[PDB]
Amino acid sequence: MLLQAQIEAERARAAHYMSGAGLQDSKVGTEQAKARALASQADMTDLN
Amino acid sequence: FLEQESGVQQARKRELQQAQSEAQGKLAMLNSQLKRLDEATSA
């Protein structure tokens, strides 16, 4: 009980959470790119 | 966007066809008088 509940559960949860944090930090850049692209499209529409 | 604001967008799109058609037709039709001169000098 104790051995598995400690090694298997908690360390795995830590790894999962760190991976999630890295993923969010990655997604920030895609958000930036989307913002820039939409701004450019709006500029095109205004020109037309 | 930059092109449509005063560039190749409306510079070339006439230039291409007008220059090509005019030059081709003019050169062929100028060669027409050369062919006719050959006609006259031959038969």
Q: Tell me which method was used to determine the 3D structure.
A: cryo-EM
Q: Which residues contact B27 (CB under 8 A, 6 or more apart)?
A: none
Tell me, yes or no, if A39 comes closer than 8 A to chain B by beta carbon: no
DSSP chain A: -HHHIIIIIIHHHHHHHHHHHHHHHHHHHHHHHHHHHHHHHHHHHHH-
Pair A47, B5: CB distance under 8 Å: yes
Residues of A in contact with B5 (CB under 8 A): 47
Tell me if A45 sits within 8 A of B1, measured CB to CB: no
Which are the contacts of B4, defined by CB distance < 8 A and separation ≥ 6? A47, A48, B10
Which positions in chain B touch A43 (Cβ < 8 Å)?
A: 1
> What's the resolution in A?
3.1
